[PDB]
From Swiss-Prot, chain A:
Primary role: Component of the 20S core proteasome complex involved in the proteolytic degradation of most intracellular proteins. This complex plays numerous essential roles within the cell by associating with different regulatory particles. Associated with two 19S regulatory particles, forms the 26S proteasome and thus participates in the ATP-dependent degradation of ubiquitinated proteins.
Pfam family, one: Proteasome_A_N
Expression induction: Down-regulated by antioxidants BO-653 and probucol. Down-regulated in response to enterovirus 71 (EV71) infection (at protein level).
Record-listed Phosphoserine modification sites: 5, 12, 14
Protein name per the record: Proteasome subunit alpha type-2
N-terminal signal peptide: none
Subcellular localization: Cytoplasm; Nucleus
Source species taxonomy: Eukaryota, Metazoa, Chordata, Craniata, Vertebrata
Family from the record: Belongs to the peptidase T1A family.
UniProtKB/Swiss-Prot annotation, chain B:
Protein name: Proteasome subunit alpha type-6
Assembly with partners or alone: The 26S proteasome consists of a 20S proteasome core and two 19S regulatory subunits. The 20S proteasome core is a barrel-shaped complex made of 28 subunits that are arranged in four stacked rings. The two outer rings are each formed by seven alpha subunits, and the two inner rings are formed by seven beta subunits. The proteolytic activity is exerted by three beta-subunits PSMB5, PSMB6 and PSMB7. Interacts with ALKBH4.
Organism annotation: Homo sapiens (Human)
PANTHER family noted in UniProt: PROTEASOME SUBUNIT ALPHA/BETA (PTHR11599)
Top-rank lineage group of the source organism: Eukaryota
Functional summary from the UniProt entry: Component of the 20S core proteasome complex involved in the proteolytic degradation of most intracellular proteins. This complex plays numerous essential roles within the cell by associating with different regulatory particles. Associated with two 19S regulatory particles, forms the 26S proteasome and thus participates in the ATP-dependent degradation of ubiquitinated proteins.
Family classification: Belongs to the peptidase T1A family.
InterPro entries in the cross-refs: Ntn_hydrolases_N, Proteasome_alpha, Proteasome_alpha-type, Proteasome_asu_N, Proteasome_sua/b, Proteasome_subunit_alpha6
GO BP term, example: regulation of inflammatory response
Single Gene Ontology MF annotation: endopeptidase activity
GO cellular component terms given for this protein: cilium; cytoplasm; cytosol; extracellular exosome; mitochondrion; myofibril; nuclear matrix; nucleoplasm
From Swiss-Prot, chain E:
Membrane-crossing residue ranges in chain numbering: none
Post-translational modification note: Sumoylated by UBE2I in response to MEKK1-mediated stimuli.
Family: Belongs to the AAA ATPase family.
Record's disease association: Deafness, cataract, impaired intellectual development, and polyneuropathy: An autosomal recessive disease characterized by early onset of deafness, cataract, severe developmental delay, and severely impaired intellectual development. Patients later develop polyneuropathy of the lower extremities, associated with depigmentation of the hair in that area.
Source organism: Homo sapiens (Human)
Subunit details: Component of the 19S proteasome regulatory particle complex. The 26S proteasome consists of a 20S core particle (CP) and two 19S regulatory subunits (RP). The regulatory particle is made of a lid composed of 9 subunits, a base containing 6 ATPases including PSMC3 and few additional components. Interacts with PAAF1. (Microbial infection) Interacts with HIV-1 Tat.
Phosphoserine, modified sites: 83
Localization per record: Cytoplasm; Nucleus
Protein name as annotated: 26S proteasome regulatory subunit 6A
UniProtKB/Swiss-Prot annotation, chain G:
UniProt cross-references to InterPro entries, sorted A to Z: Ntn_hydrolases_N, Proteasome_alpha, Proteasome_alpha-type, Proteasome_alpha_type_5, Proteasome_asu_N, Proteasome_sua/b
Complex and partners: The 26S proteasome consists of a 20S proteasome core and two 19S regulatory subunits. The 20S proteasome core is a barrel-shaped complex made of 28 subunits that are arranged in four stacked rings. The two outer rings are each formed by seven alpha subunits, and the two inner rings are formed by seven beta subunits. The proteolytic activity is exerted by three beta-subunits PSMB5, PSMB6 and PSMB7. PSMA5 interacts directly with the PSMG1-PSMG2 heterodimer which promotes 20S proteasome assembly.
Lineage: Eukaryota, Metazoa, Chordata, Craniata, Vertebrata
Organism: Homo sapiens
SMART domains with a match to the protein in the record: Proteasome_A_N
Primary role: Component of the 20S core proteasome complex involved in the proteolytic degradation of most intracellular proteins. This complex plays numerous essential roles within the cell by associating with different regulatory particles. Associated with two 19S regulatory particles, forms the 26S proteasome and thus participates in the ATP-dependent degradation of ubiquitinated proteins.
Protein name: Proteasome subunit alpha type-5
GO biological process, one term: proteasome-mediated ubiquitin-dependent protein catabolic process
Length: 232, 240, 238, 240, 146, 191, 228
């Protein structure tokens, strides 16, 4: 390149960030998904549809592990996800190299959000177009955080991204409670998944992973369809 | 709508769009060509016609079937510049794989590298996004044949048989009704279907010279290009 | 016009108007002409003065014993590329211990000017460089341009109203092979006197003469030894 | 308008009006054509003398990259010179690292990539040149390549460049080309390039002629032009 | 080129133009009329205008290269008393990037310029001065060159 | 350690001992001195171990990629050119006695010598290694121009036999290879 | 209204340096005279407030013991060129044991007369008159922001530089004398200025072959005003 370095993101005369505000829109236009943390671990479920019957399903994957006890999913545009995925892959590694121990979850939300925020303030590059969800049973109590294009993050007992995240938001507020178990939380998660899903909901129409205190794990289409009984 | 320079650079629209890349997809359409790829039970085949409007224009210097490795074939669309420049990238990181890890690169992995590279072409706002398309095939151990499609947008996905060029919708329409009806796929099954879908979309009944056929099969993993003799053998083969 | 601002911008007709402007920059400078015999090369330049008490700006400048060049247009690029030239001559002068043949030197000049003609934020060089000297095979006369189009001419003229100046060249070009220095120089200077008003030609304060000969190192004359050359001339008719 | 400015912005339909302009910019130059017989390659170029304008023989567009490698430039001149320097440098690197003559394919491909580099950024524009690539071998034979401003490059048995291009290539295909000797083809092209540019447009032009191949022993050199002078005696008998 | 155009303007223009297309080519052709059109910029037009039968032949006009300039000046220098020492080739090579109109205009101004001093014939210097007037010289102090 | 290379009409023939030592200890009985760079190009290495191995890997890298771009078979002279480049480039840090060989379609069997200096040269037959100084007399009078392939096999067999016998550094077992237009034939012997 | 700072005019001269020459017109005026006897120099101080100390403002500045300086325009910008001017000359002596000639110096200064850019700033905004005796007698040169370097016999620049050069041409001849050129200069000074000439408005600088230094203590100024 040449070294222009000048940031393309400035404050509005009103005092707003037009680019971040727009990127949040494309984030909202992404695929819906939700996760829950109930007293034993966390469950993550997405809204994965193949636009044609010629696609492969065992090729592309959404619920993605980072460490043996740390799972992550997203809502936005697919391609930008994988970059920051790999970045977090390395970033979790250097901690383990330094201290010889699995990095705590909150540290990852710290460093990743730092990378994204700095990347927002940097020059000549649009911010990302995906929000993220992270879960992990670090030291018994699992954790479930959310990032955003603005680099911010929170700690959610359970929430959902994608389309109609406010409708499924309220649905989570009502059907949800203080405490549950993993299977029940799966049941309600698929409940809100069918809340906006298409007609037929099969093992491939979605995909789900979980964190346990025994570590992070992904769910296979076998137990997916097996759990499809007692729908919603 | 247009706001600021969303019409000019890689930024977001008020609707959350970006006009450049979607300008780029139809930028492949100026190539005036349509490609076809199919995976079989133990084989996968590529095929695509060519246009030789000149007698002075050589024949062997027109091929788009590009041998990447001894077990990796690929085909291109869009513009020849971006295609060829894509080529040395593919070959280059392909060899870098062998140097770093010893064994052979997975065809899916290489698609990962290419899509990731193409990611920045859209990501930075000071670089043209290389408006061409990518197609790969190759045999996998414990996995059989595989086919993938790399895009200027920077994403990919597996298939079972897929076409590209200018007639995406039509060829996909033909293939969907063609394959899903419990089709057992032999070698000449997949091949004959390959010639037939194209010759139906274009309504050609081509001479065996114009089209090109790449092939890989799990009896000789070497990526192989077809000779017009055998190609004619299959042509008359489907010619009842 | 909006596409007529920067060098990187092409034209819808396919003509980067910047270089076209730089060509205009050369037309403003004073006039000067070069040529060569079968065995000699001579170029004369016209001087100008800002005011009466101010001296006349010099045009010819020595570079190497067998390399002489004129100037036209700006001056910053003049001294810059000139410094590049003096550098380059002594370069191979130090490496091979031999003079630089004119041709590939000139090509080095064009290659030098090529880059800022294409990269962003880089103006061309406004200059009308005329070159004369010997290689191993006789004199040579090369002219330059902002477009960097070195021309192996026999005699040229650049600057203000060099249009008519060129005209006198062809009708005596056949004479431009057999005459030696004495009448040759006055052959050349006869062509400058038409590029002026009809009331002042050469009054020993506005002319310089650079020469290169076989046993003659490149020499420059200005207003005092030119006087002997200034004699033996017919006035302008009317 | 509003989009043709940068070299890094796609049109709303999917092309680049920069390269669009630059191509026809090369189209406005005089004609330079090339051909290849069974045992060599011949280059021909028409040059234009304006009134006097130079000592004849100046600024010939028939360049020479390697001892066996010939150029045929057209369009803009200086950028063509830069390109020739790039090629000479390149072949020097190849000889340096590997110690033998560079294949015409690899050379043209590398140069093509380097051309493609100047079509992806706003910092630089594309080139305003095009040209030919002539080579001959005892182990390879006659090979002739062609390069556009965009970056496409491949082979021919013959090709033309300049204003009179399509009309030029018309009678070009009229000739037999397989069995012809390049010595005959010399006087041959002379008729081609002498049935083109006329009066009420330009002026007395110029006919330069490069010639490489078997008889040249692989070495590239200009034709002996005044020698044997059959282009003109053969390039005139077309009075009727 | 029509588009999503709002309340006024186009909302009758394309109606009339469409009447032009249909009345020109297509329904009930004729051979007893020939159509010549001329414009400046081509990019605004529609395809149906330039299809292949509404407008058959396309003729571009490049400006005078050299001899067209010199000869055009020689053409408007037909009705003026000319001193027969004048090179139209010099005139052409010094007249750069002009048109037929401007080349006419210089020949126009030269006669009045000579009329300033009341001369009868002309001079090359006359044409030069007319060139200067046609070129719209700005200012002075451009003297730190050379 | 001892390396043996000879070309014949149909192709070329290579061989070497398998013995790998350190100081005065047999670090390894049997070892692959030969190296399959390309399907028709082998190299026998000598001197340092890690040097020869790493250099072999890199040269396999550049040659492999470059051949893929070539879309044609590589040239033995080219491959030796690479080793000349690296070895001469880093002559201050390497101890290699690399000898390159292989059949070529354009030129049949070829043998090139690459001593520790960094020079390159073609020969009718080249030998290298520590014990290689013990067999010049036998190899000279023993050699006869225009032998057959199997004649080459017995020739080299007796050669490395004598070298392994007399040298305390060389030994182990005899590895042999033969390359022609057809393919590659390898084998291990004794006696 | 934002074009390239390194782009030529459509007519072909320049964009910004044309403005740079324009900026010198608003500066204070100054006059120099090169006599066979020596070189004299004068400038007006353009005092504003009585609280303003006069001597803190200066236009005549020495670069070498036999090399004077005269500036007009952006003073602080001129300061850098002054410093480099002293520096490189000192390089010349501490590398050759001889004094760099007047013209030769201004070559060095005018080298970076035009070197603003992006890789590796803007053009400068001051004009300069340089006087100094050398092997070729007293020397007088004049420069500009465009790096155009030239010699003059007696140049005058500043705001009223037009009438300065005009009337000055009416009064100069080749065989002038020192004091004659002095009072002749100051007459132009009073004719061009607006404040009443005194011991504070202006200032001189006189370099001589014998009087090798320029020496203009005050009240010789008054000594000449009373003589005028």
């Amino acid at each position: 390149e040449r070294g222009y370095s000048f940031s393309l993101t400035t404050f509005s005369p009103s005092g707003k960030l037009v680019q971040i505000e727009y990127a949040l829109a494309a984030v909202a236009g992404g695929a819906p998904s939700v996760g829950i943390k109930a007293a034993n671990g966390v469950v993550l479920a997405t809204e994965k549809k193949q636009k044609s019957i010629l696609y492969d399903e065992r090729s592309v994957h959404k619920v993605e592990p980072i460490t043996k006890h740390i799972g992550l999913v997203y809502s936005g545009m697919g391609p930008d996800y994988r970059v920051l995925v790999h970045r977090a892959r390395k970033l979790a590694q250097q901690y383990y190299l330094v201290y010889q121990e699995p990095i705590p979850t909150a540290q990852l939300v710290q460093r990743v959000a730092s990378v994204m925020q700095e990347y927002t303030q940097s020059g000549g590059v649009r911010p990302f177009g995906v929000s993220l969800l992270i879960c992990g049973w670090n030291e018994g109590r699992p954790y479930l955080f959310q990032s955003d294009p603005s680099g911010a993050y929170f700690a959610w007992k359970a929430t959902a991204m994608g389309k109609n995240y406010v409708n499924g938001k309220t649905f989570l507020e009502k059907r949800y409670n203080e405490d549950l178990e993993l299977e029940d939380a799966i049941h309600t998660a698929i409940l809100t998944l069918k809340e906006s899903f298409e007609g037929q909901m099969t093992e491939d129409n979605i995909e789900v992973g979980i964190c346990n205190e025994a570590g992070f794990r992904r769910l296979t289409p076998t137990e997916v369809k097996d759990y499809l009984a007692a729908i919603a | 709508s247009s706001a600021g320079f969303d019409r000019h650079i890689t930024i977001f629209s008020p609707e959350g769009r970006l006009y450049q890349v979607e300008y780029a997809f139809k930028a492949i359409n100026q190539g005036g060509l349509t490609s076809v790829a199919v995976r079989g039970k133990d084989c996968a085949v590529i095929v695509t016609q060519k246009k030789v409007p000149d007698k002075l224009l050589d024949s062997s210097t027109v091929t788009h079937l590009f041998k990447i490795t001894e077990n990796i074939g690929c085909v291109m669309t869009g513009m020849t510049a971006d295609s060829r420049s894509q080529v040395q990238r593919a070959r280059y990181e392909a060899a870098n794989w062998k140097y770093k890890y010893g064994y052979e690169i997975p065809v899916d992995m290489l698609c990962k590298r290419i899509a990731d590279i193409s990611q920045v072409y859209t990501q930075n706002a000071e670089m043209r996004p290389l408006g061409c398309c990518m197609i790969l095939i190759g045999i996998d151990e414990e996995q059989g044949p595989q086919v993938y499609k790399c895009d200027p947008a920077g994403y990919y996905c597996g298939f079972k048989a897929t076409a590209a060029g200018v007639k995406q919708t039509e060829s996909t329409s033909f293939l969907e009704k063609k394959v899903k009806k419990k089709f057992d796929w032999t070698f000449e099954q997949t091949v004959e279907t390959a010639i037939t879908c194209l010759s139906t979309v274009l309504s050609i009944d081509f001479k065996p010279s114009e089209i090109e056929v790449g092939v890989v099969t799990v009896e000789n993993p070497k990526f192989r290009i077809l000779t017009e003799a055998e190609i004619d053998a299959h042509l008359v083969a489907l010619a009842e | 016009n909006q596409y007529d601002n920067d060098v990187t911008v092409w034209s819808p007709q396919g003509r980067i108007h910047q270089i076209e402007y730089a060509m205009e920059a050369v037309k403003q400078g004073s006039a000067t002409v070069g040529l060569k015999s079968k065995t000699h090369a001579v170029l004369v330049a016209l001087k100008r003065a800002q005011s009466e008490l101010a001296a006349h700006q010099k045009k010819i400048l020595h570079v190497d014993n067998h390399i002489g060049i004129s100037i036209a247009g700006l001056t910053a690029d003049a001294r810059l590329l000139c410094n590049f030239m003096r550098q380059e001559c002594l370069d191979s002068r130090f490496v091979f211990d031999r003079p630089l043949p004119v041709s590939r030197l000139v090509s080095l000049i064009g290659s030098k000017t090529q880059i800022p003609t294409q990269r962003y934020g880089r103006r061309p060089y406004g200059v009308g460089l005329l070159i004369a000297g010997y290689d191993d095979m006789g004199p040579h006369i090369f002219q330059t341009c902002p477009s960097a189009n070195y021309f192996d001419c026999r005699a040229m003229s650049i600057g203000a109203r060099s249009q008519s100046a060129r005209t006198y060249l062809e009708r005596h070009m056949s004479e431009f092979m057999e005459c030696n220095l004495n009448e040759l120089v006055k052959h050349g200077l006869r062509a400058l006197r038409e590029t002026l008003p009809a009331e002042q030609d050469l009054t020993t304060k506005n002319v310089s003469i650079g020469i290169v000969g076989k046993d003659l190192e490149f020499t420059i004359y200005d207003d005092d030894d030119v006087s002997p050359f200034l004699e033996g001339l017919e006035e302008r008719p009317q | 308008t509003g989009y043709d400015l940068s070299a890094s912005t796609f049109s709303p339909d999917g092309r680049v009006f920069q390269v669009e302009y630059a191509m026809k910019a090369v189209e406005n130059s005089s004609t330079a054509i090339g051909i290849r017989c069974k045992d060599g390659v011949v280059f021909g170029v028409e040059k234009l003398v304006l009134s006097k304008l130079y000592e004849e023989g100046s600024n010939k567009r028939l360049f020479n990259v390697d001892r066996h490698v010939g150029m045929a430039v057209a369009g803009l001149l200086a950028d063509a010179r830069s390109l020739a320097d790039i090629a000479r440098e390149e072949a020097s690197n190849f000889r340096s690292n590997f110690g033998y003559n560079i294949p015409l394919k690899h050379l043209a491909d590398r140069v093509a990539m380097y051309v493609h580099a100047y079509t992806l950024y706003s910092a630089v524009r594309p080139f305003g040149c095009s040209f030919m690539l002539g080579s001959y071998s005892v182990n390879d034979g006659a090979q002739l390549y062609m390069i556009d401003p965009s970056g496409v490059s491949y082979g021919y048995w013959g090709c033309a460049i300049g204003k009179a291009r399509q009309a030029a290539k018309t009678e070009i295909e009229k000739l037999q080309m397989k069995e012809m000797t390049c010595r005959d083809i010399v006087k041959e092209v002379a008729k081609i390039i002498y049935i083109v540019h006329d009066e009420v447009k330009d002026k007395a032009f110029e006919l330069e002629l490069s010639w490489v191949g078997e008889l040249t022993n692989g070495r590239h050199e200009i034709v002996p032009k005044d020698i044997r002078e059959e282009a003109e005696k053969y390039a005139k008998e077309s009075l009727k | 080129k029509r588009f999503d155009s709002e309340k006024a303007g186009d909302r009758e223009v394309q109606r009339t133009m469409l009447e032009l297309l249909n009345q020109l080519d297509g329904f009930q052709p004729n051979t007893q009329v020939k159509v010549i059109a001329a414009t400046n910029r081509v990019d605004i037009l529609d395809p149906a205008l330039l299809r292949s039968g509404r407008l058959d032949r396309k003729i571009e006009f490049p400006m005078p290269n050299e001899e067209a300039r010199a000869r055009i000046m020689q053409i408007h220098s037909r009705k003026m008393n000319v001193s027969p020492d004048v090179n139209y080739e010099e005139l052409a090579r010094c007249t750069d990037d002009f048109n037929g109109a401007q080349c006419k205009a210089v020949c126009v101004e030269a006669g009045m310029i000579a009329l300033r001093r009341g001369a009868t014939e002309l001079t090359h210097e006359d044409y030069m001065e007319g060139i200067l007037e046609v070129q719209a010289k700005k200012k002075a102090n451009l003297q730190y060159y050379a | 350690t001892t390396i043996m290379a000879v070309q014949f009409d149909g192709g070329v023939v290579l061989g070497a001992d398998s013995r790998t030592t350190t100081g005065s200890y047999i670090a390894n009985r049997v070892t692959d001195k030969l190296t399959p760079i390309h399907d028709r190009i082998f190299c026998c290495r000598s001197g340092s171990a890690a040097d020869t191995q790493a250099v072999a890997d890199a040269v396999t890298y550049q040659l492999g990629f470059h051949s893929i771009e070539l879309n044609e078979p590589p040239l033995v002279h080219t491959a030796a050119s690479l080793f000349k480049e690296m070895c001469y480039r880093y002559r201050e840090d390497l101890m290699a006695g690399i000898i390159i060989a292989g059949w070529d379609p354009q030129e049949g069997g070829q043998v090139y010598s690459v001593p520790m200096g960094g020079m390159m040269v073609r020969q009718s037959f080249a030998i290298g290694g520590s014990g290689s100084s013990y067999i010049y007399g036998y190899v000279d009078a023993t050699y006869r121009e225009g032998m057959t392939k199997e004649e080459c096999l017995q020739f080299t067999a007796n050669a490395l036999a004598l070298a392994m016998e007399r040298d305390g550094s060389s030994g182990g077992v005899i590895r042999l290879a033969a390359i022609a237009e057809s393919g590659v034939e390898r084998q291990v012997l004794l006696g | 209204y934002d074009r390239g700072v390194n782009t030529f005019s459509p007519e072909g001269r320049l964009f910004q340096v044309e403005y740079a020459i324009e900026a010198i017109k608003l500066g204070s005026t100054a006059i120099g005279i090169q006599t066979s006897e020596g070189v004299c120099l004068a400038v007006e101080k353009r005092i504003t407030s009585p609280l303003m100390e006069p001597s803190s403002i200066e236009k005549i500045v020495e670069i070498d013991a036999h090399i004077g300086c005269a500036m007009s325009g952006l003073i602080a910008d001129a300061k850098t060129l002054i410093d480099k001017a002293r520096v490189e000359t000192q390089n010349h002596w501490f590398t050759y044991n001889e004094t760099m000639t007047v013209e030769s110096v201004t070559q060095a200064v005018s080298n970076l007369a035009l070197q603003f850019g992006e890789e590796d700033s803007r053009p400068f905004g001051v004009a300069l008159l340089f006087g100094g005796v050398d092997e070729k007698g007293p020397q007088l040169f004049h420069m500009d922001p465009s790096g155009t370097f030239v010699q003059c016999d007696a140049r005058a620049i500043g705001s009223a530089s037009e009438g300065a050069q005009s009337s000055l041409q009416e009064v100069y001849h080749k065989s002038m004398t020192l004091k004659e050129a002095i009072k002749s200069s100051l007459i132009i000074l009073k004719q061009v200025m607006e404040e009443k000439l005194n011991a504070t408005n202006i200032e001189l600088a006189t370099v001589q072959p014998g009087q090798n230094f320029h020496m203009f203590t005050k009240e010789e100024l008054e000594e000449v005003i009373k003589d005028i």
